[PDB]
Structures are given as structure tokens and as C-alpha cells.
Design a protein around this ligand. Structure first.
Ligand SMILES: Nc1ncnc2c1ncn2[C@@H]1O[C@H](CSCc2cc(/C=C/CO)cc(C(=O)O)c2)[C@@H](O)[C@H]1O
Ligand SMILES: [Zn+2]
Ligand SMILES: [Zn+2]
Lengths: 115, 298
């Protein structure tokens, strides 16, 4: 029944005042993109930064198994859009937030669906 | 320097035609630095400018393009150059990368180990290398042609680069190889390209554009490296990040370049001319299969 819970550990480390994971790979882009969360090429809008996906994945970066049966990663090989206000901690952001399965935007940072 | 708005500067043809003796590299702007956009790594900026320059060449861009990237890791365990290549290349391009040290990547497949352990069944349309051994920066010893990963790279080009394909291989004042310059004469065109963001370094990318599989011109690589250094010594390049701010035309154009299988006997002058224009790739179109040799001991 024992499983390492890295997500919880990082969240707790952050609240303890720990410095976020660094060296996430920020891309050059137009910043006129769709603003969707996870895309095949950078899609940051004016309020976002785009990052290489693998570098923003807690499991990729910590060299640990991805938390699902077949160990698949939703970020690797893609680009993740992070609100500029949160881009000091891309890994924390991707861990703590969710993508609207209809609009492709981050819940609470672009999703309009619940208006 | 209207050069400052370009992604970088390519070695002018007249410098390639000289017969200079090798001198120490002494760059006027040594220790100058470009101001990068906020939060952007040198490696992202450098690869972005390399790709912006490659956008100006007659690269073959087939469907299901195959690209391999050597030296793709960093001391932080991520792959910024691979991330730029994946941004640049058409969606669906198969991208493999590799490094001596472990790292996490956006490539479709990654191999960890010395490049000499890497084998591939298939041929490639584009080879990028950032490999570099900092021990070569010994200013107190004679600057001779280096072997090491350069020996592997030369063999890999001759054995696993599709006709029509291209390469960009990092060199520096002390990290260079004469046979690799000689191999540049087996392409329709070649240059040494300096990124504007890193122009304070003797780094360049040796670019071979459209591989022909035979010598089109005979190049003495000892002389040409001397020519390269002479160019760098006499042409200060103004550091610049300007081209990083306009990414609207960055993605590599999907050309749908034809891919054909042909045996050496069918490579006629008409085929050679299509290869030279970036209009043909010659290789098989089977599955891409790669591996890393593992040495077993106690
Ligand atoms: N045969 C081989 N096979 C496979 N990969 C090989 C390799 N040879 C080197 N690479 C890899 O090339 C990549 C870029 S070299 C980046 C670099 C490292 C250092 C390290 C200094 C140590 O303190 C200094 C500089 C600099 O600019 O001064 C640049 C490294 O990731 C190496 O692993
Ligand atoms: Zn991951
Ligand atoms: Zn939504």
C-alpha cells in the first residue's frame, strides 16, 4: 500500500517557504497565441509564458514514476502555458491546477465555460 | 552592422577561399554579453537563432522528417535546445536526442550514454550537435584537430545522413576536426554560422546544406579552420538579441519534400541537382529504430 506522494511533498515544501523548482525551459514566442493550457507548440497569450513541457513536470524532473497505471506524462513533448504571475513556479502551477476538458484553458485562468 | 538585426553572421565566401595559417583566436568583444529577454536561457536564445538562420537555407523538409540531436543535455538535467527544435520542426517530426549525462527531454526518444554507443537502423534528414568537451580549451598546447566525438560524427554523417539532408555541428577555436571540414565539401553548400547572442565566443555551427554523398569540392580542414579563425579575428560581431523578439515566421516551412529510395547507380547529375536545391531526400521510409550499446562488467 505504500506509495511515495511527491505531489504532496512539493506542496508542503512550498508552504514551508521552499524555493520553487528552477530551470524550467521558457520559450521565445509571439505571445499572441490561443492561451490554451497544454499545446503542441507554444501558445502563450499576452498574459502567459510558454515552457517546454517535460521541464515543468514534477515527475519528469524528480525522476519518479508518473501517477497513473501506464506511467504516461501529459506534458512531455508539449508546451505548457503558465500565467505570467505564476511563472516563478511552473511545476507547482501544473500540479495544483486543472485543464478544462471542453475549452482547453486552465480552470480559473482562462476557462469561460461557467459564465 | 545591419548584421545586428539578423539571427547571426555566416562566414563570408571570400574568407573560405583563403589559405591562412592558424593563429590564436582573440575576439575584440570577448566577455561582452547580449542582454537576453527576461527569463530566457542562453541555450534557448542560441538555438532559436540557429533555427532562424536555417530557415534561410534550402533545407529538405519531408513528411515524417527525422531529426537527431547530439549533446542535448545540460548540467541542470533538461534539454533547452531540444525544446526549441521541437518548436521549430513541423508537428509530427520524429526527434531523437542524446547526451552523455542523464536529462529529461521533449524529444520522442532519448538515449543516455557516449555518442559512440548510439546506433540507428534508419537514416536522418537533419543532424544537430552541441557536443563540446571543455578540456579542449587548453591555450598552452598546440591547437590540433580533435578526435573523440568528432570521429563518431563524421562516420555518422557518411553512414546515416540521407542524401539531401543537412547538419549543424558545434565547433569552437579548440573544439574542431579537420575531416568534418573536409566533409563540408560533400554538401551542395556549407558555412560556419555564429549566433548574434553568443558572438563573444569562438563557437560556431558548421552547417552542411544538402548532402551529396561524394566530394563536390576538396577542402583541407586544417586550412579552413585557420580561415575561420582569421575571419573571427578580423570581424568583430556585435552581440545582439534583436531577432529573438520577432517569432512570427519562426516555424520551419513544411515543404513536403519528396523522399525516394535509390541505389548508388541511379544518382545522376539530374538527381544531384534536385538534391542540391533542397527538393529531394534519398533514403528508405521504414520504421525508425535506435539503440544504445551497454557495456557489461562487474
Ligand atoms: N562524447 C559525448 N557524447 C555525448 N555527449 C557529449 C559528449 N561530449 C560532450 N557531450 C555532451 O555535450 C553537451 C554540451 S557541452 C555543454 C558544456 C559543458 C561544460 C562542462 C564543464 C564541466 O565543468 C562546459 C561548457 C562550456 O561552454 O564551457 C559547455 C554536454 O551535455 C555533454 O554531456
Ligand atoms: Zn512528466
Ligand atoms: Zn472551459
Amino acid at each position: 500500500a505504500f506509495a511515495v506522494d511527491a505531489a504532496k511533498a512539493y506542496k508542503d515544501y512550498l508552504a514551508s517557504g521552499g524555493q520553487p523548482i528552477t530551470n524550467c525551459v521558457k520559450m521565445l514566442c509571439t505571445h499572441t497565441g490561443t492561451g490554451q493550457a497544454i499545446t503542441v507548440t507554444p501558445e502563450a497569450n499576452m498574459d502567459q509564458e510558454s515552457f517546454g513541457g517535460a521541464s515543468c513536470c514534477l515527475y519528469c524532473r524528480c525522476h519518479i514514476d508518473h501517477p497513473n497505471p501506464k506511467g504516461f506524462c501529459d506534458l512531455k513533448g508539449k508546451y505548457v502555458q503558465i500565467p505570467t504571475t505564476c511563472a516563478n513556479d511552473p511545476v507547482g502551477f501544473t500540479l495544483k491546477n486543472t485543464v478544462c476538458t471542453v475549452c482547453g484553458m486552465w480552470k480559473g485562468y482562462g476557462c469561460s465555460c461557467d459564465q | 552592422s545591419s548584421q545586428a538585426w539578423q539571427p547571426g553572421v555566416a562566414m563570408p565566401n571570400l574568407y573560405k577561399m583563403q589559405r591562412m595559417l592558424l593563429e590564436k583566436c582573440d575576439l575584440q568583444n570577448y566577455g561582452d554579453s547580449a542582454t537576453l529577454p527576461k527569463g530566457i536561457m542562453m541555450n534557448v536564445a542560441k538555438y532559436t537563432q540557429l533555427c532562424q538562420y536555417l530557415n534561410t537555407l534550402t533545407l529538405a523538409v519531408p513528411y515524417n522528417m527525422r531529426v537527431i540531436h547530439f549533446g542535448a543535455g545540460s548540467d541542470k538535467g533538461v534539454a533547452p535546445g531540444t525544446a526549441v527544435l521541437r518548436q521549430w520542426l513541423p508537428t509530427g517530426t520524429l526527434l531523437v536526442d542524446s547526451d552523455l549525462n542523464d536529462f529529461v527531454s521533449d524529444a520522442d526518444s532519448t538515449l543516455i550514454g557516449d555518442c559512440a554507443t548510439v546506433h540507428t537502423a534508419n537514416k536522418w534528414d537533419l543532424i544537430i550537435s552541441d557536443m563540446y568537451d571543455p578540456k579542449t580549451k587548453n591555450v598552452t598546447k598546440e591547437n590540433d584537430s580533435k578526435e573523440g566525438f568528432f570521429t563518431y560524427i563524421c562516420g555518422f554523417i557518411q553512414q546515416k545522413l540521407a542524401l539531401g539532408g543537412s547538419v549543424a555541428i558545434k565547433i569552437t577555436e579548440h573544439s574542431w576536426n579537420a575531416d568534418l571540414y573536409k566533409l563540408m565539401g560533400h554538401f551542395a553548400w556549407w558555412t560556419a554560422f555564429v549566433t548574434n547572442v553568443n558572438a563573444s565566443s569562438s563557437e560556431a555551427f558548421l552547417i552542411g546544406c544538402n548532402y551529396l554523398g561524394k566530394p563536390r569540392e576538396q577542402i583541407d580542414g586544417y586550412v579552413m579552420h585557420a580561415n575561420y579563425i582569421f575571419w573571427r579575428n578580423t570581424n568583430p560581431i556585435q552581440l545582439s538579441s534583436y531577432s529573438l523578439f520577432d517569432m512570427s515566421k519562426f516555424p520551419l516551412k513544411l515543404r513536403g519534400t519528396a523522399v525516394m529510395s535509390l541505389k548508388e547507380g541511379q544518382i545522376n547529375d539530374m538527381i544531384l541537382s534536385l538534391l542540391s536545391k533542397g527538393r529531394l531526400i534519398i533514403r528508405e521510409n521504414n520504421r525508425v529504430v535506435i539503440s544504445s550499446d551497454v557495456l557489461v562488467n562487474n
